[PDB]
Amino acid sequence: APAPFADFAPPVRPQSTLRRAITAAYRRPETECLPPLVEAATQSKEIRDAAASTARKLIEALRGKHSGSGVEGLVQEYSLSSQEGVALMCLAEALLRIPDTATRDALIRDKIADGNWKSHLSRSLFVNAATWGLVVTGKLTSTVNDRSLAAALTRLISRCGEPVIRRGVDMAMRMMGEQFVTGETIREALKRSKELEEKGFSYSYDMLGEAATTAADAERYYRDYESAIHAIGKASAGRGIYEGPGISIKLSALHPRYSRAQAARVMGELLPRVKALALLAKNYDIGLNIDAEEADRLELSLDLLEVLCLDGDLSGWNGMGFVVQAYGKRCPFVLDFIIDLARRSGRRIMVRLVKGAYWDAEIKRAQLDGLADFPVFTRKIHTDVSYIACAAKLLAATDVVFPQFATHNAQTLAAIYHMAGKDFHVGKYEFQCLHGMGEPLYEEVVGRGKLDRPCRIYAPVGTHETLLAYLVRRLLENGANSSFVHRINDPKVSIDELIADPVEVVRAMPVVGAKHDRIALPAELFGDARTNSAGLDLSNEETLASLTEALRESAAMKWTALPQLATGPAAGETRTVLNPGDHRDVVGSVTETSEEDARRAVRLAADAAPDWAAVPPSERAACLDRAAELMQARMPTLLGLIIREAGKSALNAIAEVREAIDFLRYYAEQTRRTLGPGHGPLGPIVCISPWNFPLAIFTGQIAAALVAGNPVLAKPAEETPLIAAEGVRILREAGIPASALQLLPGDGRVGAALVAAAETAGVMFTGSTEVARLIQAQLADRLSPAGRPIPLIAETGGQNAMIVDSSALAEQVVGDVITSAFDSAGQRCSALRVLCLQEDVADRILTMLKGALHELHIGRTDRLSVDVGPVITSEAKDNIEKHIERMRGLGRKVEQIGLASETGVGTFVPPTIIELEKLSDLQREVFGPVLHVIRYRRDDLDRLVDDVNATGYGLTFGLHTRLDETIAHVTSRIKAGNLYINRNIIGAVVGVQPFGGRGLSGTGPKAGGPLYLGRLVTTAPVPPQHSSVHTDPVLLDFAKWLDGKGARAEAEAARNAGSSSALGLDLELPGPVGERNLYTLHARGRILLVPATESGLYHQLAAALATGNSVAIDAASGLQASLKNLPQTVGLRVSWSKDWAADGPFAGALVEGDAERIRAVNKAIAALPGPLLLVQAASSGEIARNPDAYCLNWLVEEVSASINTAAAGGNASLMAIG
């Protein structure tokens, strides 16, 4: 039996002093980074003045020859609006997908110019309109208003005809064939390079590959690089690495799992591929540059650079190159490492200094991961100082490295030109620029008549498809508000402003190196409301080394879970708790609760209830906040327990502990916002939690119940009692009295005994729908001492779909699908179960998905390299496998990963893809790593949404599309609680995506949302921000009808309900950059009304209508004559039901009657098939006395929507942050 965590995340190599200095700087506070950069970048006043003069001269040259762009001239000639310009370029792009020229021109003349372009051109014309929007307007719009573009295209064609189409086609052909790329193929690019080479430029060809998703992708990128090296080397013809052309590669193109977590595969599989390419570059004596990518790949890439530079087979060749990003805090330390490596190896490493291309993505990633700080600067001027400081370091080392200063900023250029001094020879250093962007500047640099310094042009090479994939990121490099190229084209920016010295500006700031005011550190995402939980950086070697030791220590602990009654630990049946990934690994011991002790615990909770209710809400919230601090400090140990007890990966364990911390802090803050003396607790609450979020959901339910003033009986899932016991220990340490929080480990029998206990005043259940239904039936037997139903929150299963159309980027889709379906072995309630692919793209995406499936590592989760862990039990495994084999037996195509022999000691199911004919082929939630794939024709999208809704579930839902019309359609028609656009569908964040569904997926209110605490008190408070200015119009029609009938009191109550209803609430919740998180209140659906009196019926109708619902009224009430002559608008919402089971599904119920009538109705309601109904009951006297007899909080449905606004390739809002 392998020792737990003995091989968790060993580094590729022992970290040298120089490597450790890099890691130490990863997230160093910005105020600490700047002072040494300012000092290193300082130059003499004489040099600064000469640099400013050179920069001014270059800028004056740039602005003097600056003409109007081709697109601008086209927009001017045809008087195009911006949308028309964008639509025209999209049309031109589509026409260029027609390969034959004569065919294309015939389509233009005979069909496009004089008729409906729509009839002639499965794929929206406007798929890339966000890119063309950047080209035309300079502004990024993340999604495409395809209806506006279609209108604009019709308008411009009908107005201007063939001539404008011809001009647009010719413009797009030039831009996509000669500007965004040097050429479509390496041979074409090489042919077009001779002109500038003759002037003194050189070239580095960028083959535009990146982010391989499959082994086949990586092999394709490999053979593309290999073929390009041959062409470049043949053309170089012995010119060598400085005069002659070279190639640039991205490591992410060469392996589908290029990450620190997969470092062993990277060194074993990616490295030999780079070596083979480098050997070919050596033979031709050309440069081979490794481009720099995301910050979490920097240090990993250094391990490849080290091995290659020490490999004797590459000796004699100085063409190996490596990019370093000056926007990164580690940059100077990386340079120190590289310079030393160049000294040790004797290789004159070609070092390309760039600022960095991934800035907005780095901000978003650090915020999402809750990390200490950013790995990049947050003020643009800091990057500029960093660049100059790093140039100073490089210029001191030209004997051992070849510095390559890649920049389009004439101020940066001038500073370095003068820093380098008078002595120059080709080979000492060079500048670099981007093809079709930097030539105007560098035509003022290259040549004896200019500055006589060489410039290497980074030359993209590729087809239209290849160049468009990440063109947005490239356009933002030089097109943001802080970008030099954007500013040089802004007439409101003076030359004096452009030549401003960033070194001196930073030096004079009040606080040198202060963070940008408008970028929140991850801890501060929520501002004054609460402190964000902190994560851990699994790319940081210090973090991995520290976590390795903490994880090993956690595995040595004698974890136990006992029945912790108010009186102390109780005796019971004790058994071991085994690691699901290896049953030989005993994690701890659980003593389970007898049914007698469960009943005793409820009585003890009932006796203790007044004492806990008397703790003021602020103090109860303080306990939650203290518990959050304790869990944050204990996170490494908690991770180890979650990994081993629940079979979770470290990444998912981190998120689990963060969620528990977030629940504690969120419910604490919500309490401080709401709870007062009049919001009395229900009493003892039974909290029954599932195994799959054994700390987070466990903590969330208990924390909410406790902070609302209720004592808690906590019944964790039988599979995962140990982490639950630790959570209870932490809450008790934080100040929750033992009498207020009792842990009762055991199976469903303990849960059922707790539910059935007479003093149980409320039940919070998260688990399967089938078990919730049994709990619902048991609670229907009971009424509170006041004679009202026992509140049940039942958050249950999902049958979660993702719809993908032909506008989505397949690589993005596949990543989000692989994560959503197979993370946690599909054992998230939110997991993607059904992927729906538009027919035209289905085969391509399916091929990519299967390829990505086979790159997953399944095994025991005490290794960072494991992507998918075990399923929780052999019974779960058998249940999942029975489903897979049923599908296989029906002839459905089944793709499965092969499992390693090591999985035999645990319970594993390989990630599986099953292709279905229809969504209806899938009949039940299969809680495992099983993705079902269906295909749909675009015209059947609305029917498909019906099919998704038809399962009865409504938990999470994803949509991948760029098209606003599709977003609007799908999101308006789907009925699910958590919607996700252009991102994965998992990992809902407390207070950001309040989580919970409808139908068979939940009663609500949503956990992690603002209605939750109000369910746990007898009188719900008004949640923060909970109101709406909208009044339901059918409610208004009903109020007028009531007035016409003379029911004046009820009409007033109806108007009050119309105002008090929060239907129509529509909020954006604070969260990370690059995402829009929305929270809205909608009608629940059809509410079952069970009235007893005419006035009761009118009050019930008012409540239901005010919240946007339709109703089914019990025909057995005999009250049909009370609704004579209803307005048609109200009648449309009213049905009468004799057979309630036939007229569902309902989305809630309102009941009027005495206690025994309520009990009877509650039993009849519990017997209805399908979803658990949130039932509210009141007596006739209560309706007369209490305007809030029926609470409107429970008659609306919460919907959370999370939109990835960075999905097009950049963040429009951050383009304004410099």
Next chain:
Amino acid sequence: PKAGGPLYLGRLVTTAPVPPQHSSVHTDPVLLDFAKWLDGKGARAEAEAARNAGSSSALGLDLELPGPVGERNLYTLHARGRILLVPATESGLYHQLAAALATGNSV
């Protein structure tokens, strides 16, 4: 159509142009249900006309128009109300219904 508004000139030509800014991302849900019903009964040409009407309808357009400071000037497209349909043929009726439903109307 309104004088001083973007639909006006289109009434004075035999084929109306697409006015500036005249589009909507919203699709009438009853139109969508009608298109599916047409699909189910094999009325393929009519279902296509229905989907096309659903998309080209500007129902739900909601624009702020440029004007003076201190004022917000909004322009929105709503359903007309109830449209009288005087068909002659079944297909003609389906096309009339598609047009009316796509623009949010009853008939």
Next chain:
Amino acid sequence: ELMQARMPTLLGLIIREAGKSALNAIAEVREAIDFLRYYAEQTRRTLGPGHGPL
């Protein structure tokens, strides 16, 4: 342009023929100017050979 330049004369006629005040007569001429320029611009944005007159 002509109505703008001749607004004072147009005002006097509108005041005397239609009984309007000076402020309302100014607004009237401005509206005529705005209609002219608005329909001119709307034409430039929309009308092509397939939009035949009635």
